[PDB]
Design a protein around this ligand. Sequence first.
Ligand SMILES: O=C1NC(N[C@]23C[C@H]4C[C@H](C[C@H](C4)C2)C3)=N/C1=C\c1ccc2ncsc2c1
Length: 329
Amino acid sequence: SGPVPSRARVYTDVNTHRPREYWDYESHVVEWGNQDDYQLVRKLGRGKYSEVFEAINITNNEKVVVKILKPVKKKKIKREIKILENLRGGPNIITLADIVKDPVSRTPALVFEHVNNTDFKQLYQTLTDYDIRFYMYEILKALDYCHSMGIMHRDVKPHNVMIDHEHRKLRLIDWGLAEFYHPGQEYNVRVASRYFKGPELLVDYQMYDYSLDMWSLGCMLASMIFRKEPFFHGHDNYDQLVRIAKVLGTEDLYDYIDKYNIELDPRFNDILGRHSRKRWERFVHSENQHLVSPEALDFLDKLLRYDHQSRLTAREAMEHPYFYTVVKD
Ligand SMILES: O=C1NC(N[C@]23C[C@H]4C[C@H](C[C@H](C4)C2)C3)=N/C1=C\c1ccc2ncsc2c1
């Protein structure tokens, strides 16, 4: 028997209908720039896979960001690069401006457009109900674009959303875990941050799709409107599914595993137990009430569904009543 297969409900065959070179990133040959065009100014941060710096392009004096890669398999660099090139000019996608290699240490560096980004903690503190709706709509433009272009980000989370509040301007960054969607493909589940992982990853269902990004958007929305970051605070990959089960209930979970005939790691047997599906009110308090509204909760319910096939698409989400104010403006 083994697991029941799955196809995306949308954008299913988009890569099939493209030339091979579009998605066959292992064949991509990288176009190098001149490393001497960029001088590093200061360090902005350490990532899992990179060090990130402010730099100046001495050619034109433009401010630029340089992500110096820690060692990874070349095929993964080509993948990140290919996806960035494919998505360049798309709505609210970071622009890759150049690619250089240190000619001695041989370590590669991606050069990005600069976002004058507001600090993440100071932003998830000052955001009105309207700002959230605005920025969520802006993120969904990025997700609908990338999905329509055959790509799933697989690392949606607040740290990978760069907002310049002063200019009402948003960019979805860090495409280093992104992958091409191909029907029938089994993907690695060891992706995304713990708190943003979909159930499909947690139960080891590999034949997942774009809808993964819609779960992780849900997790973001919840933490923003209920002011609880993270929203699903698991202690590990197993307890993460338990945290989810304590909110969504276990009846839907076991129906989900039954539908796709998922062999469940026996360990999970114990710790899941039996849990009712909770109502969103439990997380409403006087600190957050100004951000919680019936539309917001309707919207959130339709993202956070175990069964990836039944979650909103990006395009559907953008048509939800939560965004009727933003759409008019
Ligand atoms: O690919 C990237 N990866 C990361 N990763 C980090 C990881 C931590 C959180 C956040 C800021 C630092 C530390 C760098 C993203 N940044 C990246 C890109 C980037 C592009 C433009 C830009 N403009 C202002 S900040 C910024 C960052």
